[PDB]
């Protein structure tokens, strides 16, 4: 009202209030008579992005709503971060990045590795070298 | 699909680390794997935590030996002296000597408020006609400066204080600041030369200032004491006035 058309990576087209879909600084710039295409964002992920943006269109410590909305699996979080990054939507980049950062809080190295299924790259002498460099910072 | 946090772009991983409290990044996250260790040891992560929190801007143009250190110290930076202007009476201060008609608290003139390059000094402490001294001890650990930070980095310790005394004043302004060990044993003392104190005793607000550098390992407390010591010639009902005292720890 007026509305622009957005094509996801897997065919599906979407239309959106032009001023809601300008929380993205990427598309904002592109507007300056087709459908704009988005290689890196698929349907599942694009739908949540316009959603997050419509809820946040009227707007001037992670709001309750943002927390429930983001109660998804690691993998779709990751893709959320990426779209946010590619579309350049600061607000969304920030809560997603925080939400992932909150899963790193309070945990040991082994506990972090396990949450994200990361393999210990390290030799035991490389580990010991890292604790040494962290001397200034321990109690 | 991204099937693992480490398939994210480096730039995003940096962005994530940004939101992890720094202490935890260093102790826990440098250990998770070698990618994380390499990423966390880049200047750019810290450089831009600093930016997200106001400690610096785009026009930052000074060499910084270690950005992790720089970051923590700026993050902890604030006056470590409680109730330095007299917004809450004598709370937090020991009236070590409280002679005469005693220490008072009183309001600054709107004219005298300008003499501070802060708008936010609205009161002072003033001494009586006999000697009056007060004190406060800073507990470094308890203010966020853990031990190995003090010992390893030896960050600069900056002390300031403002007073006003007439040249003719019946009691002379005095200031002593000592660094102290875990035993409360002195590890460096500062008193300003009395000559340059008398020089500052026109009737206006003057700063006095000092920075301790290269102090030894072991510093756990700082003792700060000030007031007026009686000259023994009467010259009025009050002596030095003092306010806006401060102690901070700055990136060295």
Numbering used by the authors:
A (entry chain B): 1 to 32, 42 to 69, 84 to 162
B (entry chain A): 2 to 253
From the article:
The SCF complex, one of the best characterized E3 enzymes, contains four subunits: Skp1, Cul1, RING-finger protein (Rbx1), and F-box protein. F-box proteins provide substrate specificity to the SCF complex, and consist of the common F-box domain interacting with Skp1, a linker region, and a substrate-binding domain (SBD). Fbs proteins recognize aberrant N-linked glycoproteins for the endoplasmic reticulum (ER)-associated degradation system, resulting in degradation by the proteasome. The sugar-binding activity of FBG3/FBXO44 has not been detected, although SBD in FBG3 has a 52%, 68%, and 43% sequence identity to that in Fbs1, Fbs2, and Fbs3, respectively.
The structure of the human Skp1–FBG3 complex was determined by the molecular replacement method at a resolution of 2.6 Å. The FBG3 structure consists of an N-terminal 310 helix (310−1), an F-box domain (residues 9–50), a linker domain (residues 51–78), and SBD (residues 79–255). SBD is composed of a 10-stranded antiparallel β-sandwich (β1–β10), with three α-helices (α6, α7, and α8) and one 310-helix (310−3). Although the overall structure of the SBD of FBG3 resembles that of Fbs1, FBG3 has two additional α-helices (α6 and α8) and one 310-helix (310−3). The overall spatial arrangement of Skp1 and FBG3 is highly analogous to those of previously reported Skp1–F-box protein complexes, e.g., Skp1–Skp2, Skp1–Cdc4, Skp1–β-TrCP1, Skp1–Fbx4, and Skp1–Fbxl3-CRY. However, the comparison of the substrate-binding pocket of Fbs1 (Phe177, located in the loop β3-β4, and Tyr279 and Trp280, located in the loop β9-β10) and the corresponding residues of FBG3 (Tyr130, Tyr234, and Trp235) are not well superposed. The side chains of Tyr234 and Trp235 in FBG3 are oriented in opposite directions to those of Tyr279 and Trp280 in Fbs1. Although the sequence similarity between FBG3 and Fbs1 is high, i.e., 133 out of 255 residues in FBG3 are identical with those in Fbs1, four loops (β2-β3, β5-β6, β7-β8, and β9-β10) exhibit different conformations. The hydrogen bond network in FBG3 is found between the loops β5-β6 (residues Asp169, Cys170, and Gly171) and β9-β10 (residues Thr232 and Tyr234), whereas Fbs1 has only a single hydrogen bond between the loops β5-β6 (Gly218) and β9-β10 (Ser277), suggesting that the interaction of these two loops in FBG3 is tighter than that in Fbs1. The carbohydrate-binding pocket is formed by the residues in the loops β3-β4 and β9-β10 in Fbs1, whereas distinct hydrogen-bond networks among the four loops β2-β3, β5-β6, β7-β8, and β9-β10 in FBG3 prevent it from forming the carbohydrate-binding pocket shown in Fbs1.
